[PDB]
Design an enzyme around this catalytic site. Structure first.
Site, PDB file in Angstrom:
ATOM      1  N   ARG A  30      40.683  39.939  37.448  1.00  7.23           N
ATOM      2  CA  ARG A  30      40.205  38.655  37.939  1.00  7.23           C
ATOM      3  C   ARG A  30      40.721  37.488  37.113  1.00  7.23           C
ATOM      4  NH1 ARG A  30      35.340  42.263  39.603  1.00  7.23           N
ATOM      5  NH2 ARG A  30      34.784  41.330  41.616  1.00  7.23           N
ATOM      6  N   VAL A  31      41.121  37.730  35.868  1.00  8.45           N
ATOM      7  CA  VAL A  31      41.889  36.754  35.106  1.00  8.45           C
ATOM      8  C   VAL A  31      43.360  37.117  35.237  1.00  8.45           C
ATOM      9  CG1 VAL A  31      42.127  35.558  32.913  1.00  8.45           C
ATOM     10  CG2 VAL A  31      39.945  36.607  33.529  1.00  8.45           C
TER      11      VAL A  31
END
Lengths: 55, 240, 57, 249, 57, 124
Positions: free
Chosen positions: D113-114
């Site tokens: 997600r990053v």
């Protein structure tokens, strides 16, 4: 003409064999499904009763 | 948060946007405290008062004569199981429903909204217009019909199909890829700035696609475009 | 000389030469369906290009 | 103000121990006899890893929890709870492991997600093309193994996709520097590996690393100093020079 | 396996079974018609075989 | 008429796999599929539009007796709506007979009404 007749007969035989195999697989999968369903019901009710009588 | 919003609803007569994050966590915490509170367990380990608590929370988020509160809520579905008691109980309180599918997410289509499972009671001919209703229903029917053809194609290939379902699938792929959009917040993920599409142009583009005005364009040109001019621009940039 | 797509693909996957071929035919062919291919096959023997013909089916 | 990396080797064992002690303290059981706060346990544990602000000193803590599944059943209670907490997951599959793909990261399901915000410029530039090249190859064969017919462009999707799978393979205890990673991924994504056979891709990669170590030191220095790609023409010429002396077999 | 996986497998297998049954039912009629076509071909083959066996010697 | 409607729908619910296969002419199954598609189209209904039983009986009779066979599937609902509009205009005697006796009207008169409407109907 013999080639076309043989092709159609071969398709018919292969398709009926495939249908029979599919029916057998469906029967076995249904048996497995019923066993899993019974096991799930038993586990759920056992957990509920254990939690209830733990009080 | 609801208490902060209700003041603006009632005492000032404003229109309030109540963005609530995962509702599932509220129910989960209620179930976490349930066993220590001394209460008997329920079907899937939830608290007995699940529906009562859920309703007492949700019924306060309503529009009245003084003002209107509109709420958008994210709801977690545990392990993609839509029969779980918390998501199953949450459905009763909603006017519009948007379902996200891992199948669409993995295929590369975002927002990955399921075009068939999503529902809304505002989709009526007297609410959105007869043309909009016709376009939406035609798109849904085309997608449902295409879903059926995939079962046949997976065994017998594309060539075995006739020349009308050929057109059906050829346009359904275009529709499915055109349902995608590039978001402003997805710029951090893709490097491409997002776009805003008005509903009139959305309807016009989908109607044109259904009528086949852009049937000659390549299939991949419709991914993450926005407007209907942008797919033509992409096709121009990548050949046709 | 091959009739049908499957044999054509089988031979073209290998490196065997194919002179003539016909692919899509009715399920119930009529007298004029493969007239041209048959005439050409006979002509290839007629002009001395072939020594003999064997057919498999 | 320092940076720390922490590995939790089996949160499933931690959860089992917690369940054991809770049952021994006579607390009422929940699902699968786990206590009600089993999710709270792991949330409390994993929320303490963070990147602090500049006012707090700028320190950071990185966590890599482990979860073991049973026959790939990621739908179980503990795996679901842990998946819902972290910022991403990496799926290792026995099917990919025994097919030769080691390490066995499932690229279709692994997510971060990053993404991008945790990469240098060159890596961000080349991984964008790498992701598309892998996804297209995977989705081409996902629907069917062969299909009715294949185009020349589709044959290219299948050849470069296979070469990506060959490139992503790696052996034990031999980490690769980021500059060599970006250089080899550039060489792949720009089409220099099309002529190199699939069975020779790995040896090509090794000898390419040696060639860059011996001759292409300036490119490595530029990458490690600026975090961005060097000149396109110089890198193209270096790759061509290595490919001239590489021996096909 | 799990109940949902087994249910999906059952549904897919049932769809495949129906498709194969339809294909078999079509192929039976096609074979029946091909037999009649082969029967129709017979007299021309007989007459041409006789006339060739006579003349060619 | 309900028995014939049930039989026609039951025949069409099976043989659904045969939609794609045997798209060429067939003596029996083609007719069954064509009748079933029109039956499904007839059974559709709009929201908050209840229909009187005397009109339901007439439309089901028209479907089952074969008067819808020469009409495309896309025109079936428009045919039904225009037939309902025609009924309360002209077949008032048939409607009153159905309402009062709970029985089907005279077969020949019903047939004449149906062909009279079919003459006016425009196939699109």
């Amino acid at each position: 003409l013999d080639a076309k007749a043989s092709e159609h007969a071969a398709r018919m035989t292969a398709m009926k064999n495939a249908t029979d195999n599919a029916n057998e697989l469906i029967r076995t999968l249904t048996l497995s499904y019923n066993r899993a369903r019974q096991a799930a019901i038993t586990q759920e009710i056992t957990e509920i009763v254990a939690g209830a009588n733990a009080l | 948060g609801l208490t902060m919003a209700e003041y603006f609803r009632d005492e000032q007569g404003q229109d309030v946007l109540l963005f609530i994050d995962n509702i599932f966590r509220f129910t989960q915490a209620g179930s976490e405290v349930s066993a220590l509170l001394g209460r008997m367990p329920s079907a899937v380990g939830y608290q007995p008062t699940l529906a009562t608590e859920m309703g007492q929370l949700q019924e306060r988020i309503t529009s009245t004569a003084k003002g209107s509160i509109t709420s958008i809520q994210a709801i977690y579905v545990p392990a993609d199981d839509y029969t779980d008691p918390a998501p199953a109980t949450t459905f009763s309180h909603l006017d519009a429903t948007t379902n996200l599918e891992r199948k669409l997410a993995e295929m590369g289509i975002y927002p990955a909204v399921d075009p068939l499972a999503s529902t809304s009671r505002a989709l009526a001919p007297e609410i959105v217009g007869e043309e909009h209703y016709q376009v939406a229903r035609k798109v849904q029917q085309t997608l449902q019909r295409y879903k059926e053809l995939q079962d046949i194609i997976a065994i017998l290939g594309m060539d075995e199909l006739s020349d009308e379902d050929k057109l059906v699938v050829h346009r359904a792929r275009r529709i499915q890829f055109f349902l995608s959009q590039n978001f402003h917040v997805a710029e951090q993920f893709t490097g491409q700035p997002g776009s805003y599409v008005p509903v009139k142009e959305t309807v016009r583009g989908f109607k044109e696609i259904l009528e086949g005005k852009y049937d000659h364009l390549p299939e991949d040109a419709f991914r993450l475009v926005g407007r209907i001019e942008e797919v033509v621009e992409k096709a121009k940039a990548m050949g046709v | 000389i091959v009739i049908g797509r499957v044999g054509l693909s089988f031979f073209r996957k290998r490196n065997m030469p194919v002179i003539l071929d016909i692919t899509r035919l009715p399920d119930q062919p009529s007298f004029a369906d493969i007239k041209e291919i048959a005439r050409k096959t006979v002509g290839l023997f007629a002009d001395g290009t072939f020594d003999e013909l064997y057919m498999y089916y | 103000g320092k940076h720390v990396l922490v590995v939790y080797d089996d949160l499933s064992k931690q959860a089992a121990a917690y369940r054991e002690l809770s049952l021994l303290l006579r607390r009422p059981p929940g699902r699968e006899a786990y206590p009600g706060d089993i999710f709270y346990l792991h949330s409390r544990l994993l929320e303490r890893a963070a990147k602090l602000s500049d006012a707090k000193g700028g320190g950071s803590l990185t966590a890599l929890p482990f979860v073991e599944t049973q026959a790939g059943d990621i739908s179980a209670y503990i795996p679901t709870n842990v998946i819902s907490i972290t910022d991403g997951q990496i799926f290792l599959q026995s099917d990919l492991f025994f097919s030769g793909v080691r390490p066995a990261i499932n690229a279709g399901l692994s997510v971060s997600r990053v993404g991008g915000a945790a990469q240098i410029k060159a890596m961000k530039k080349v991984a964008g093309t790498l992701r598309l090249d892998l996804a297209a190859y995977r989705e081409l064969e996902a629907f069917a193994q062969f299909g009715s017919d294949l185009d020349k462009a589709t044959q290219a999707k299948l050849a470069r996709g296979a070469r990506t799978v060959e490139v992503l393979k790696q052996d034990l205890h031999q980490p690769i520097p980021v500059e060599k990673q970006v250089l080899i991924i550039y060489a792949l994504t720009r089409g220099f590996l099309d002529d190199i056979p699939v069975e020779d891709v790995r040896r090509f990669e090794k000898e390419f690393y040696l060639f860059l170590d011996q001759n292409g030191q300036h490119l490595l220095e530029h990458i490690r100093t600026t975090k961005d790609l060097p000149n396109e023409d110089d890198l193209n010429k270096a790759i061509e020079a290595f490919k001239k002396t590489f021996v096909v077999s | 396996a799990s109940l949902r996986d087994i249910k999906t497998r059952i549904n897919a297998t049932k769809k495949t079974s129906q498709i194969t049954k339809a294909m078999e039912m079509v192929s039976t009629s096609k074979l029946n018609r091909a037999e009649q076509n082969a029967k129709s071909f017979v007299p021309y083959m007989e007459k041409i075989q006789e006339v060739v066996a006579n003349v060619a010697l």
